[PDB]
Amino acid sequence: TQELGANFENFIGATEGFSEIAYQFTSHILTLGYAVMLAGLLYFILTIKNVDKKFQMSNILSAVVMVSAFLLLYAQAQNWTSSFTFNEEVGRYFLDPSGDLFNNGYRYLNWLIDVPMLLFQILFVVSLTTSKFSSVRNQFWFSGAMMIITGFIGQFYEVSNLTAFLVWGAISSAFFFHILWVMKKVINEGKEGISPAGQKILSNIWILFLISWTLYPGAYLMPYLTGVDGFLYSEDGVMARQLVYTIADVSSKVIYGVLLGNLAITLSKN
Numbered sequence: 341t342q343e344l345g346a347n348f349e350n351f352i353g354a355t356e357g358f359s360e361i362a363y364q365f366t367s368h369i370l371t372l373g374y375a376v377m378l379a380g381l382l383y384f385i386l387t388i389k390n391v392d393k394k395f396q397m398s399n400i401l402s403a404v405v406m407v408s409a410f411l412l413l414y415a416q417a418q419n420w421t422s423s424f425t426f427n428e429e430v431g432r433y434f435l436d437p438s439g440d441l442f443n444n445g446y447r448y449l450n451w452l453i454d455v456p457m458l459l460f461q462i463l464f465v466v467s468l469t470t471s472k473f474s475s476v477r478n479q480f481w482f483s484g485a486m487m488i489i490t491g492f493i494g495q496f497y498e499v500s501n502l503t504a505f506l507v508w509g510a511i512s513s514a515f516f517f518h519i520l521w522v523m524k525k526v527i528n529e530g531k532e533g534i535s536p537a538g539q540k541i542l543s544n545i546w547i548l549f550l551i552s553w554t555l556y557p558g559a560y561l562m563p564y565l566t567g568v569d570g571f572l573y574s575e576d577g578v579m580a581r582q583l584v585y586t587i588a589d590v591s592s593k594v595i596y597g598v599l600l601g602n603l604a605i606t607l608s609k610n
């Protein structure tokens with residue numbers, strides 16, 4: 341009965357501890373994460389005049405997303421280093437009873453805030469054809485909120501009840517597939533009535549969206565992708581999970597935002 345270690349990170353940190361490499365790599369990847377958001381924030385502020393007025397809500401939403409992600413990923417980065425402390429006799433980092441313990445709340449809150457804005461912002465760059473703005477918006481927001489809420493419920497049970505962790509994750513995946521379906525419709529309608537250069541950027545946005553958003557359930561399942569007591573059921577699964585989350589964050593937020601800005605610029609060229 342391991343009482344101190346909630347989530348898989350605390351469980352590993354309370355039982356086997358983290359190697360110096362695992363601890364430092366995770367710290368550095370999380371720091372790179374918030375550093376890139378700060379850089380993106382300055383980018384989306386400074387380039388806002390490069391797009392026509394009618395598209396600027398997309399730049400605005402990118403910047404607000406950068407603020408939320410910078411703040412919350414900074415908090416998560418400090419939560420990592422504060423939750424695990426070095427033991428000299430073993431030579432590894434263990435869960436620190438005097439710390440606050442690692443907490444996925446920061447990242448999940450960031451998702452709850454950012455998912456609706458990221459889905460919303462494309463609607464200020466492309467034009468729909470036969471779909472209604474309000475209908476697409478409401479579907480994005482409802483399914484986006486439900487995907488994050490049900491995923492957050494599942495993640496509590498990650499250590500204590502693997503069955504609940506997977507079932508809630510499956511429910512969350514149902515809302516995710518709904519979002520993918522709606523976004524593909526948005527991309528297709530967005531391609532109608534624009535230049536071939538604009539259509540090519542939208543093609544790339546779809547691939548970037550599909551890959552980067554699918555990385556999140558992949559990192560959710562990461563500790564179990566090689567089975568209980570498998571190679572990933574260890575600090576290596578923690579490292580891979582946090583690496584994939586950070587890649588996903590930079591791609592789904594920053595790169596996505598840059599591509600939408602590039603689309604908005606191209607649309608003014610006709």
Ligand SMILES: *C/C=C(C)/C=C/C=C(C)/C=C/C1=C(C)CCCC1(C)C
Nearest residue numbers: 451491509512513516556557560592
């Ligand atoms: C920058 C924030 C982004 C775009 C967050 C997106 C998060 C999701 C696509 C995560 C969805 C999940 C599942 C599909 C199943 C497992 C639980 C989640 C919440 C990780």
Ligand code: NA
Nearest residue numbers: 421422424425
């Ligand atoms: Na520490």
